Design a protein around this ligand. Structure first.
Ligand code: CDL
Ligand code: PC1
Ligand code: 3PE
Ligand code: 3PE
Ligand code: SF4
Ligand code: SF4
Ligand code: SF4
Ligand code: SF4
Ligand code: SF4
Ligand code: FES
Ligand code: K
Ligand code: ZN
Lengths: 263, 176, 95, 96, 114, 129, 207, 108, 48, 378, 116
């Protein structure tokens, strides 16, 4: 009817107008790498990890924000696309701290995984790294902002989902910093969710700090009884002990969020 | 290329036949064997005088596990569980929590020395040179429980052998 | 090496060989147990340019098996040319 | 340091000690409880705060490649010191 | 044309008349293949290779130079393989593998990874 | 056209008596057939593509000597991978296990527009980037 | 060249592709699929009825002469109707080549024993029965080879627990070694190691 | 040291369990222990005999030869070096040197 | 030490007759060598 | 016929018509440990040590077979210096195996003295193992992508000194066995195997070459750098135990020939593949680079992903063709790992080779097959 | 075609039952020898009761192929006993002499633990 035909590596896919290159690639089972894009949050298009080649075009386009035009062939694995990914990954890891052993995100880190799947295997950064001071925003979220990759997921979550416009970016350029700019606490019934959407260990659960690694936990899908909403959760256990509670997606109940009490 | 090991034709001339007849009747090749054992009797034996002499080892020797410290006395281990994840025998059990001063440290570090295969993968996977396999190979026990090490035992081994562990690491870290 | 001259002759004659040149006990020809520190070389991927991983990614060049026949005049062939016959060694054809 | 409980049993650096009524104290009868006397928490507190004259400082733990992964510490806060995440050494920015 | 003393392989005796044995065996193989349907691929191929090994036996009286042509090792090995080929063609008549496929596999029998 | 002779068996397929599993671990166990939920800490969806069959959890107790987590459940670590829901249900039916099946939860398509961030009269206008 | 990437050998790949068609043309009754991998290994997938015809042809045919059975094993894929995949690895000394022949069966369907073709299959098929439970018809002596006497179950099946169901212990009351249900002082720790991000796009299965 | 290389089970004084002990083999190991004249000591060599070792979690492995026979000395390693085993034997000699059978008998 | 002896017999230790209050005149044990001398006595180094 | 359940890790159920043997029924599984099932729960790196413990006399040859199989699926290539070390320690490991095979075979039939002489040479090759890896037997040194560490300075000199004197050690072994009539009576015409039967019964290694079959995977299907070294393949003529014994003694000589060339042609360079997504980075660069630390973290927690596929990779191990049928599903843990032990097919043929011999010959036949039950049982 | 399944030995339950009775007769006559060779402390009556009990468990089967495997396994089990490949421990693992009786009712299971 009103669908248009686009090609993903040659294969034809029928998509409705306004679909982005990232969503068109999603129908044929291809997941474009991303750091800043979240389907529950507004499109930011700033990390540039979703750059993908379009056949017969000179410039790679941001897949998360570019709406797909009829007849486009999306080259998700061409050399130009692969070289675009490595360069962006090289820039993300230039100033990133060597905190993987002491970082709670180790083992379940998008920066680690997409580095091993889409980035180079070595560094050519011979300079000194950047360091940032840590911001205290309450007893639930532990901030180590030297690890932040300025993806602005937390800012857009607190503004659009939680309704609290207390997070933002202060500064400019390489010194741009995410935080409150004042000694303020980000306490909300949905605050703990900025931990899950943060790709890196910049925002980590404070109660859960240092206790377990992702690979050694057992995931049990259960339900929440702290309220009558019935949020779907995953209960992480390790050697017969409950380590933490995570959201479990359910479009019709809680999407992918849980309140602080459930968490 | 190939070669035959047992494809000779014995010469059947009278002299050669009589050479084999002398070998059969006079046991020449059997006495030739007694000569070889006689010679060994007069060589110096290769035995060493253990425990007063010890077999030679190298800095890389994989012996008893141990936990190390920084020159300040702070423990090197920051509870990253890479040794636990790599250990092919699942001999390492680790628990961790924020210490009183807020540091990332272990509250349990057990190595079941009866599950361990002494592979050394733990000292390779450690990013801070905390867990190592020291040079001691003489720690046999009289009971099974004595080989279930905990953090107190492993720290004591580090304090015990730090003088030799540091010198072995100094002599081998450039190959790693 | 401490053996007297007479005992050296007695063992050599009994064994039929010169055992003194090939002692099975190591004395001083071995390497020193403390060695100067090394400086190992780096591999061919230690370059600051013209070194994008996508051009040297072995795993990503692996492909699924190619299907030659699926159930869903010609010259006969064999899996490969018949193996060439071996040659007797010139070093020592017969032991 | 090691502080004995009210039953004569030493408390380890992890705070573990068997309660008075615990039956597991029997395993130490005729034997000893292995406790390490060098508490790392106290030892690292004896290290002086290094005074440096720059916003950012680097720590590898000493010894170059025999230390820990080099990390960079920010010293913009004057109320507290910059603590290394690996070795626990503390750094301070000189009068600014 | 001096008869070799041994074939080198244990349990493989030396054939005194290799050429006559090969003609008899290749003749019988071509005869057995006459009972297979004309369009069966086993007939077209086995006859093809059998004839060329028969031609090389009727054009080279030298055993040493016949081995260099057939390329099957010693001439006793060629005879042994000729016996095996004859034994298979006899069995292939009973099996009749030139018929269509007995049955298709389930939809995802050979799908890997799952 | 199979030469070998075939017979007819119009019976429910059941192998519980030849698999060697003790009856205690056939009748009392509850298999769970599900597609694992995405680990919410990561945005990758590669672990939410195959069907899994796990079993109900059972007691774990501390070992007196060391405090290790002991168990007596031989199926505590058993996880099976399947291509489709039917393959899992078929496999649990022939092994005699009572099973539950949960329908796959695929995220619904979303309407994404970068230009909505700068709306003129709607509420989707963001206030920062 | 590229120091770190395995070089390709297009000559061997082409030769094995041609020989795969050669076998498929000569045994249409049984061959179901033929494929050659990127590292030059040829696989012939056949109907289980074609075990003796196909193997006999490969062993005896002049252009094949696969006179060695390198290995015979099985793989358990519980998601398939026919769980087990029987793999025959053959070596041809005449042509210095290898071929892999694969068939399939289930818990109740037997397969014809390959002992008539290769005598080496005697002990390999005893191990498949012992570890996987596949029954081989007309085997001269079929019985357990690796497991203990009276051992219930087939360990190498994908639904068999790692530590089994029973464990041994000496009991002083009965003065013999006894078997009791398995209890572990430390339970094996299941690690979820898979990465949530796709690694190899070339194998992406269509949705 | 007085330790003969190989001794028959009916002349031996110590059994050295050197290697993995599987369920199939456990009954025959006990059968040899029961037929050994006293005094009889048992030395467990290596992780597999000690506590199961690399194969601790196998369906066919006895998780330690010390649940089939009593053990007097445990020699750790995979494998223990020839010197580490000799340390165990010399450690068994010191254990035998501390025995007080006659002294305990005289005080009954 | 005596370097005219073959490798392995060119370094030896005559244990003390008393260590940590224990009479070791006859009961010498390989574990009585302290770590500093452990490295030299096992030929892991050339420097005492 | 009298039945003898000899029992114990080998149990032979034999029926004897007096002195002769009519049926021999080997009972195995006394050392079955489920190595193939356990590997399915281990990452590709964690599974490597399991291959040291299959044929525990030829440790580094087993490691090489599993490394080649994984590298083939990974589609990577170890650097040339790693391939010369693997061939070098491949042939040192053949000497370790053949010393054990020839001398325990001689020890079992009464000749006890050659065992001690040649085990002072094994004790010196175990020092090479311990100097490159820190372990005397189970090195875990050969890994997918190359080797673990470079040779320590001064090692190759000691290997040269060792290889210089070793040919005399073999000559002393032959002064005791080769021409000794008592040793020729125990082996000549014992366990004759015809070439056609050896192939059908799945034999490999010296079991084939002792019967005149000209086959050796180092020369027919070469791997690593075995096509860059000159050596000869011993071939027997009678198929008896004596011919196989001579073959094993001559291979020990050709190993010293290959070792002499590996030392001279040892090249410089890195020793593990310069691809940090397969081989771990250097520790020095693991503590200064973000990419190197991420890969170190992942390679040791999750391991590397092996593309989907199945391969049968075999090498000429000292006991015969040793291979692995390795199936990869695309994850970091192998789906299936069948281990093809050369002694599994050899032992299955003990009932045939022993037909018509005396009871004391079954000891000689088992020694000639060179059976280690770590690989038979797996 | 769905139920056109290749047989093992029996083409219908009638033939499968024939092999079961032959197997049962072989086991029934073997028990007195097993109790003698292995020097078991049980009596012949107890041994034959166990043989009877083992057959009764699989009496609900109606698939000839499944019955063929049970008979195939049964003959294999009998072979080990006749030839003395088993030992006294293997023959006595059918009786569970060291396993304390486990409660079967709800209340007794409720007190001990959580297992249903
Ligand atoms: C029967 C034949 C007569 C035997 C005589 C032994 C003898 O004189 O050997 C000398 C001489 C030394 O032996 P070798 O083979 O040259 O090796 C030793 C090194 O040369 C030199 O080695 P070394 O530098 O280590 O020499 C040390 C040795 C100094 O050399 C000796 O003490 C050896 C003399 C022992 C007599 O001192 C000792 O170790 C004292 C140990 C004495 C134990 C043996 C006592 C045997 C006495 C008879 C039993 C009485 C009860 O051997 C001969 O010349 C024998 C041929 C002449 C007859
Ligand atoms: C202690 C004091 C030192 C001396 C102790 C005695 C030493 C005796 C063993 C020395 C062995 C030397 C090796 C040797 O020469 O043998 C090779 C030689 C030759 O061995 P061959 O077999 O290699 O010789 C080759 C030539 N044909 C083919 C002809 C055989 O052995 C002999 O010549 C010995 C033969 C005489 C033996 C007769 C024994 C009769 C019994 C008399 C009882 C008195
Ligand atoms: C004595 C030395 C002279 C001698 O024996 O003759 C040498 C002569 C040359 O050798 P040849 O060319 O091989 O001749 C044999 C060919 N049929 O060879 C001869 O032709 C000699 C005659 C050949 C027949 C000789 C048979 C000798 C063996 C008979 C048994 C002798 C037993 C003596 C007692 C043994 C106990 C000491
Ligand atoms: C009888 C007991 C032995 C008595 C001591 C013998 C005298 C010691 C001696 O030196 O002469 C013995 C002699 C060995 O001396 P020789 O081998 O000739 O000299 C080697 C020079 N590098 O021995 C001999 O060679 C003589 C016998 C030949
Ligand atoms: S956020 Fe990820 S990459 Fe950064 S330190 Fe933590 S685990 Fe490592
Ligand atoms: S703290 Fe986390 S979510 Fe927020 S901008 Fe930084 S990386 Fe993104
Ligand atoms: S040596 Fe290997 S098996 Fe032993 S504790 Fe270390 S990593 Fe684990
Ligand atoms: S010992 Fe090393 S690898 Fe293990 S948890 Fe501690 S820091 Fe991590
Ligand atoms: S060497 Fe290690 S793996 Fe082998 S039997 Fe001994 S403890 Fe077990
Ligand atoms: S995901 Fe598109 S720019 Fe961040
Ligand atoms: K996070
Ligand atoms: Zn530091």
């Amino acid at each position: 009817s009103n669908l248009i035909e686009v090609f993903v590596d040659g294969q034809s896919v029928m998509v409705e107008p306004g679909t982005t290159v990232l969503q068109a690639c999603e129908k044929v089972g291809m997941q474009i790498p991303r750091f800043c894009y979240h389907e529950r949050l507004s499109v930011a298009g700033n990390c540039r990890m979703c750059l993908v080649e379009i056949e017969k075009a000179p410039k790679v386009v941001a897949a998360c924000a570019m709406p797909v035009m009829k007849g486009w062939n999306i080259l998700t694995n061409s050399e130009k696309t692969k070289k675009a990914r490595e360069g962006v990954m090289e820039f993300l890891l230039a100033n990133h701290p060597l905190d993987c052993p002491i970082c709670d995100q180790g083992g379940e880190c998008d920066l680690q995984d997409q580095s091993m799947m889409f980035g180079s295997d070595r560094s050519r950064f011979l300079e000194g790294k950047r360091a940032v001071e840590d911001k205290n925003i309450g007893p639930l979220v532990k901030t180590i902002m030297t690890r932040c990759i300025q993806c602005t997921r937390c800012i857009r979550f607190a503004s659009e989902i939680a309704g609290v416009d207390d997070l933002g970016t202060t500064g400019r350029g390489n010194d741009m910093q995410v935080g409150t700019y004042i000694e303020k606490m980000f306490m909300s019934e949905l605050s703990g969710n900025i931990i899950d959407i943060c790709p890196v260990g910049a925002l980590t659960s404070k109660p859960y700090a240092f206790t377990a690694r992702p690979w050694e936990t057992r995931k049990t899908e259960s339900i929440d009884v702290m309220d009558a909403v019935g949020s779907n959760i995953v209960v992480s256990t390790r050697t017969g002990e409950v380590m933490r509670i995570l959201p479990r997606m359910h479009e019709d109940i809680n999407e992918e969020w849980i309140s602080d009490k459930t968490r | 290329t190939y070669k035959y090991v047992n494809l000779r034709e014995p010469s059947m001339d009278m002299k050669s036949v009589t050479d084999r007849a002398a070998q059969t009747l006079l046991w020449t090749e059997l006495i030739r064997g007694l000569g070889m054992t006689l010679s060994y009797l007069f060589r110096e034996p290769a035995t060493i005088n253990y425990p007063f002499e010890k077999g030679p080892l190298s800095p890389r020797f994989r012996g008893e596990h141990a936990l190390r410290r920084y020159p300040s006395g702070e423990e090197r281990c920051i509870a990253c569980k890479l040794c636990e994840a790599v250990c092919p025998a699942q001999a390492i059990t680790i628990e961790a929590e924020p210490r009183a001063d807020g540091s990332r440290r272990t509250t349990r570090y057990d190595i079941d020395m009866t599950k361990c295969i002494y592979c050394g993968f733990c000292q390779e996977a450690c990013p801070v040179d905390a867990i190592v396999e020291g040079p001691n190979f003489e720690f046999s026990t009289e009971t099974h429980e004595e080989l279930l090490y905990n953090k107190e035992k492993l720290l004591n081994n580090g304090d015990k052998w730090e003088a030799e562990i540091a010198a072995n690491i100094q002599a081998d870290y450039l190959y790693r | 090496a401490s053996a007297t001259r007479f005992i050296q002759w007695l063992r050599n004659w009994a064994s039929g060989r010169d055992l003194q040149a090939k002692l099975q006990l190591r004395y001083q020809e071995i390497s020193k147990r403390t060695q100067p520190p090394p400086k190992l070389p780096v591999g061919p991927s230690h370059k600051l340019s013209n070194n994008y991983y996508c051009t040297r990614d072995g795993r990503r060049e692996a492909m699924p098996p190619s299907i030659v026949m699926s159930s869903q005049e010609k010259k006969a062939v064999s899996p490969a040319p018949p193996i060439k016959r071996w040659e007797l060694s010139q070093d020592e054809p017969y032991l | 340091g090691v502080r004995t409980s009210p039953t004569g049993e030493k408390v380890t650096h992890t705070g573990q000690v068997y309660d008075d009524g615990d039956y597991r104290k029997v395993r130490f009868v005729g034997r000893q409880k292995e406790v390490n006397e060098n508490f790392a928490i106290d030892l690292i507190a004896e290290q002086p705060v290094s005074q440096v004259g720059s916003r950012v400082i680097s720590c590898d733990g000493g010894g170059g490649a025999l230390g820990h992964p080099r990390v960079y510490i920010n010293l913009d806060k004057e109320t507290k010191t910059g603590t290394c995440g690996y070795c626990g050494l503390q750094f301070r920015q000189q009068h600014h | 044309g001096l008869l070799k003393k041994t074939t080198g392989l244990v349990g493989l005796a030396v054939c005194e008349t290799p050429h006559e044995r090969l003609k008899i065996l290749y003749t019988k193989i071509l005869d057995v293949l006459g009972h297979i349907p004309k369009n069966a691929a086993y007939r077209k191929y086995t006859e093809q290779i059998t004839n060329e090994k028969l031609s090389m036996v009727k054009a080279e009286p030298d055993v040493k130079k016949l081995e260099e042509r057939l390329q099957g090792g010693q001439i006793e090995e060629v005879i042994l393989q000729a016996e095996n080929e004859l034994s298979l063609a006899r069995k292939m008549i009973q099996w009749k593998p030139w018929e269509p496929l007995v049955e298709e596999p389930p939809a995802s029998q050979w799908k890997w990874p799952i | 056209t199979r030469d070998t002779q075939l017979i007819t068996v119009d019976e429910k397929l059941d192998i519980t008596t030849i698999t060697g599993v003790p009856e205690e671990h056939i009748k009392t166990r509850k298999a769970r057939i599900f597609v694992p939920a995405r680990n919410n800490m990561q945005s990758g969806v590669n672990n939410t593509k195959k069907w899994k069959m796990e079993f109900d959890t059972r007691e774990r107790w501390e070992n007196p000597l060391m405090g290790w987590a002991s168990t007596a459940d031989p199926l505590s670590n058993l996880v099976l991978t399947f291509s489709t829901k039917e393959d899992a249900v078929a496999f649990a039916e022939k092994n005699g296990w009572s099973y539950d099946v949960e329908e796959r939860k695929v995220p619904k398509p979303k309407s994404k527009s970068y230009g909505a961030n700068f709306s003129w009269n709607k509420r989707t206008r963001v206030s920062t980037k | 060249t590229r120091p770190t990437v395995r070089p390709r050998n297009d000559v061997a790949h082409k030769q094995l592709s041609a020989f795969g068609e050669y076998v498929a043309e000569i045994l249409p009754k049984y061959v179901q699929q033929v494929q050659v991998s990127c590292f030059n290994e040829l696989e012939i997938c056949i109907h289980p009825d074609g075990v003796i015809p196909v193997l006999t042809f490969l062993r005896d045919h002049s252009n094949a002469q696969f006179k060695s059975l390198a290995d015979l094993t099985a793989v358990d894929i519980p998601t398939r109707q026919n769980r087990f995949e029987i793999v025959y690895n053959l070596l041809s000394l005449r042509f210095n080549s290898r071929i892999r022949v694969k068939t399939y069966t289930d818990e109740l369907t037997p397969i014809e024993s390959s002992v008539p073709v290769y005598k080496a299959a005697n002990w390999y098929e005893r191990e498949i029965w012992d570890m996987f439970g596949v029954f081989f018809a007309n085997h001269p002596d079929l019985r357990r080879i690796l497991t203990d006497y009276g051992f219930e179950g087939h360990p190498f099946r994908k639904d068999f627990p790692l530590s089994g169901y029973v464990e041994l212990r000496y009991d002083d009351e009965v003065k013999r070694v006894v078997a009791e249900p398995v209890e572990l002082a430390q339970e094996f720790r299941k690690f979820d190691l898979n990465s949530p991000w796709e690694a190899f796009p070339a194998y992406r299965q269509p949705p | 040291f007085g330790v003969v290389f190989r001794a028959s089970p009916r002349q031996s004084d110590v059994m050295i369990v050197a290697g993995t002990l599987t369920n199939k083999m456990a009954p025959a190991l006990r059968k040899v222990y029961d037929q050994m004249p006293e005094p009889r000591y048992v030395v467990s060599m290596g992780s597999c005999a000690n506590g199961g070792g690399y194969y601790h979690y196998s369906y066919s492995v006895v998780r330690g030869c010390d649940r089939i026979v009593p053990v007097d000395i445990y020699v750790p390693g995979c494998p223990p070096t020839a010197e580490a085993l000799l340390y165990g034997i010399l450690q068994l000699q010191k254990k035998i040197k501390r025995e007080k059978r006659l002294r305990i008998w005289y005080r009954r | 030490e005596d370097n005219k002896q073959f490798f392995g017999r060119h370094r030896w230790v005559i244990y003390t007759t008393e260590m940590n209050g224990k009479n070791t005149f006859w009961d010498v044990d390989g574990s009585m060598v302290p770590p500093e001398w452990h490295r030299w006595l096992h030929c892991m180094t050339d420097d005492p | 016929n009298l039945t003898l359940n000899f029992g114990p890790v080998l149990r032979l159920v034999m029926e004897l018509s007096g002195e002769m043997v009519r049926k021999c029924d080997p009972h195995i599984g006394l050392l079955h440990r489920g190595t193939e099932k356990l590997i399915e729960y281990k990452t590709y790196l964690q599974a490597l040590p399991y291959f040291d413990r299959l044929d525990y006399v030829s440790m580094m040859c087993n490691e090489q077979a599993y490394s080649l199989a994984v590298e083939k699926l990974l589609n990577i290539r170890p650097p040339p210096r790693a391939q010369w070390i693997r061939v070098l320690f491949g042939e040192i490991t053949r000497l370790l195996n053949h010393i054990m095979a020839v001398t325990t075979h001689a020890l079992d039939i009464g000749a006890m003295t050659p065992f001690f002489w040649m085990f002072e040479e094994r004790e010196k090759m175990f020092e090479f193992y311990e100097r490159v890896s820190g372990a005397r037997m189970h090195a875990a040194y050969v890994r997918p992508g190359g080797v673990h560490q470079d040779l320590p300075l001064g090692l190759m000199d000691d290997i040269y000194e060792f290889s210089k004197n070793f040919s005399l050690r073999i000559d002393e072994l032959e002064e005791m066995l080769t021409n000794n009539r008592i040793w020729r009576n125990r082996t000549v015409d014992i366990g004759i195997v015809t070439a056609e039967d050896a192939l059908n019964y799945g034999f490999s290694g010296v079991m084939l070459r002792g019967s005149g079959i000209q086959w050796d995977l180092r020369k027919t299907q070469p791997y690593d750098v075995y096509d860059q070294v000159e050596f000869d393949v011993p071939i027997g003529s009678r198929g008896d135990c004596y011919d196989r014994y001579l073959c094993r003694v001559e291979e020990m000589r050709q190993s010293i020939r290959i070792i002499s060339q590996c030392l001279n042609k040892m090249p410089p360079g890195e020793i593990k593949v310069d691809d940090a997504k397969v081989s771990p980075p250097k520790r020095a660069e693991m503590k200064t680079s973000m990419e190197s630390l991420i890969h170190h973290f992942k390679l040791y927690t999750e391991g590397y992903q092996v593309p989907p596929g199945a391969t049968y990779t075999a090498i000429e191990a000292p006991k015969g063709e040793f291979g692995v049928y390795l199936v990869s599903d695309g994850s970091s843990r192998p789906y299936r790992c069948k281990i093809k032990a050369p002694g599994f097919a050899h032992l299955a043929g003990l009932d045939k080779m022993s037909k018509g011999h005396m009871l004391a010959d079954v000891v000689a036949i088992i020694g000639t097959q060179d059976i280690v039950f770590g690989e038979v049982d797996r | 075609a769905s139920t056109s399944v290749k047989p093992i030995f029996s083409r219908d339950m009638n033939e499968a039952k024939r092999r079961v009775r032959e197997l049962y007769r072989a086991w029934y006559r073997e028990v007195p020898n097993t109790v003698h060779l292995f020097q078991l402390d049980i009596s012949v009556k107890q041994g034959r009761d166990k043989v009877r009990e083992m057959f009764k468990k699989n009496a609900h089967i109606t698939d000839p192929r499944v019955v063929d495997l049970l008979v195939i396994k049964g003959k294999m089990e009998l072979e080990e006993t006749i030839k003395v490949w088993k030992q006294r421990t293997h023959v006595m693992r059918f009786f569970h002499e060291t396993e304390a009786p486990r409660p079967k009712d709800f209340l007794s299971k409720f007190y001990v633990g959580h297992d249903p």
